[PDB]
Design a protein around this ligand. Structure first.
Ligand code: NA
Lengths: 94, 4, 146
C-alpha cells in the first residue's frame, strides 16, 4: 500500500564511481554523444535499460583518450546505470 | 579530449 | 477485459513530461574551475534528442548552486498530473555525489530529494530519470587489450 520514497528513480551516470568522465571539446562528451545516438536509433525499439546498455558498449569500445600528457593518455570509460525503477520503461506507447 |  | 499485465510504466499520459537540461559551461573565476568546452554540443544534442521523444525540454545555462536548487524546487512543485515521467540532465564538473553550480557544489541528493515519492506526489509511481555528465572522482581507467 506504500512504495519506497526512493523507488522509481534512474541515475544514468556517465562514468563509474570514483572516476573522471571524459569530454571532447569538439564532439561533446563521450557519454552524451553515445546516449543521444542510441536514443535516436533505439527509442522506438528497445526498453530503456537495453538502450543504456548499448550506450555502455559504445562508450567502452569506441572511445579512448588522446593526450600529450602520459598521465591522461590512452584512457577508457564505462558509464554506470543505477536503477531503482520498478517497471520497464518504453518511450513509445500503443 | 578533456576531463570533467 | 482479457488478461492484463502490469510490467511497463504508463507512458501514454497526455505529455511525456519535462526534460530539464542544466548546461554549466562557464564557472566563476573564484572557484578555479575550468570552462567545459564542448558542453554546448552536448546540450544541443540532448535538446533535439528529447524533442523527438516528445519531452517538453527546457535548456538552462550557467546556473549558480542557488539557482540549481531553486529550479529543482520550483519544477518539483509544478503540475505533473498530465505528465508520464520526469527527466533532468546535469552537465557540469563534479565529484562523487556532487555536481557544481557556477559558484560552488550541490549535493546530488539535495537535487533528487525534491522528487522523492513523498515530497512530489504528482510524480509518485512515475519514472524520474537523472542523466549526469560529470566527474565522480579522479581515477583513470587504463583499460585492457581485447
Ligand atoms: Na562522457
Amino acid at each position: 500500500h506504500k512504495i519506497p520514497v526512493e523507488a522509481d528513480f534512474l541515475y544514468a551516470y556517465s562514468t563509474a564511481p570514483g572516476y573522471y568522465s571524459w569530454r571532447n571539446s569538439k564532439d561533446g562528451s563521450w557519454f552524451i554523444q553515445s546516449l543521444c545516438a542510441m536514443l535516436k536509433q533505439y527509442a522506438d525499439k528497445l526498453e530503456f535499460m537495453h538502450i543504456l546498455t548499448r550506450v555502455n558498449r559504445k562508450v567502452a569500445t569506441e572511445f579512448e583518450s588522446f593526450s600529450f600528457d602520459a598521465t591522461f593518455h590512452a584512457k577508457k570509460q564505462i558509464p554506470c546505470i543505477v536503477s531503482m525503477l520498478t517497471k520497464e520503461l518504453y518511450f513509445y506507447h500503443h | 579530449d578533456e576531463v570533467d | 477485459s482479457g488478461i492484463s499485465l502490469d510490467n511497463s510504466y504508463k507512458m501514454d499520459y497526455p505529455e511525456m513530461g519535462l526534460c530539464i537540461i542544466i548546461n554549466n559551461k562557464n564557472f566563476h573565476k573564484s572557484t578555479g574551475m575550468t570552462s567545459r568546452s564542448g558542453t554546448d554540443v552536448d546540450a544541443a544534442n540532448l535538446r533535439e534528442t528529447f524533442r523527438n521523444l516528445k519531452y517538453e525540454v527546457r535548456n538552462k545555462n550557467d546556473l549558480t548552486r542557488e539557482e540549481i536548487v531553486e529550479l529543482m524546487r520550483d519544477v518539483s512543485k509544478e503540475d505533473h498530473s498530465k505528465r508520464s515521467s520526469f527527466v533532468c540532465v546535469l552537465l557540469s564538473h563534479g565529484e562523487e555525489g556532487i555536481i557544481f553550480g557556477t559558484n560552488g557544489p550541490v549535493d546530488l541528493k539535495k537535487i533528487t530529494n525534491f522528487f522523492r515519492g513523498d515530497r512530489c506526489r504528482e510524480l509518485t509511481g512515475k519514472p524520474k530519470l537523472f542523466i549526469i555528465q560529470a566527474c565522480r572522482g579522479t581515477e583513470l581507467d587504463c583499460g585492457i587489450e581485447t
